[PDB]
Every structure is written in structure tokens, then in C-alpha cells.
Amino acid sequence: ARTLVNQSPNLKIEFEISRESNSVIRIKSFFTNLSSSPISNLVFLLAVPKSMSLKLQPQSSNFMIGNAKDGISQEGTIENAPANALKVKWKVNYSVNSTQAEETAVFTLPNV
């Protein structure tokens, strides 16, 4: 299932979160364009608690056409994350309509 992380006027961010081990969480982010215009130069930054270890594969692309569903994604894992709340800090910067946009928040993972 998808967990909603954020929805802005231009951009929807979702995580697919699953547990694989007593210590490993799989987290894949999905970016959906809510603008009729393309989003470009998309740069996503994710941080987890100090005690844990984020390991991200490369971001699939940094652009997506107007209304693209799951236009960009990034697969990763969080290590040293025991089954026993997981707080996340994320930031995204991108271009749309020849202006520069930025969204940021702190996100609490569902228990997996």
C-alpha cells in the first residue's frame, strides 16, 4: 500500500513502506505530477534518525511530463530499524512553470 507523504498544488509524494527483516525496512518513494506543465530539475533529499542507516538507489529521473503518475521514483532501505516511531525529514526542490518550487516536512513512518 502507498502512504501519502505530501500533496502540494504541483506534486504528490508517496512512500511504499515494507519490512523485510528484523532490522531492514524497504522504502520506495513515488512522485506524481499534479501540474499540467512538466516538472524538471527535481531533487529529493531524505534523512532518517541518526541511529539508523539510509541506503538509497539512484533517483530514476529528475523530470516528468504534465500529470505524470509515478513519473519519478527512488528505491531504498533503512538499516538498523528494529520492529519496536520512525521520524523522517524530507525536502524537494524542482522547477515548474518557469518558477522554482520547494516543499519540506517531517514524516512519521507507519509501523512495519
> Measured over all CA atoms, what is the biggest interatomic distance in the chain, rounded to whole angstroms?
45
Resolution (angstroms) equals 1.7
Residues in Cβ contact with 17 at an 8 Å cutoff, skipping those fewer than 6 apart: 3, 25, 26, 27, 109, 110, 112
Architecture of the 1-112 domain: Sandwich (2.60)
Method in brief:
X-ray
* Distances in whole angstroms, Cα of residue 69 to Cα of each of 13, 72, 96: 11, 8, 16
Domain range summary for the chain, segments of one domain joined by +:
1-112
CA dist., res. 61 & res. 64, Å (int) = 8
Closest CA to 78 of 58, 59, 54, 112: 54
Asked whether the beta carbons of 7 and 107 are under 8 A apart, the reply is no
Q: What is the radius of gyration, based on Cα positions, of the chain?
A: 14
Closest CA to 86 of 46, 57, 56: 46
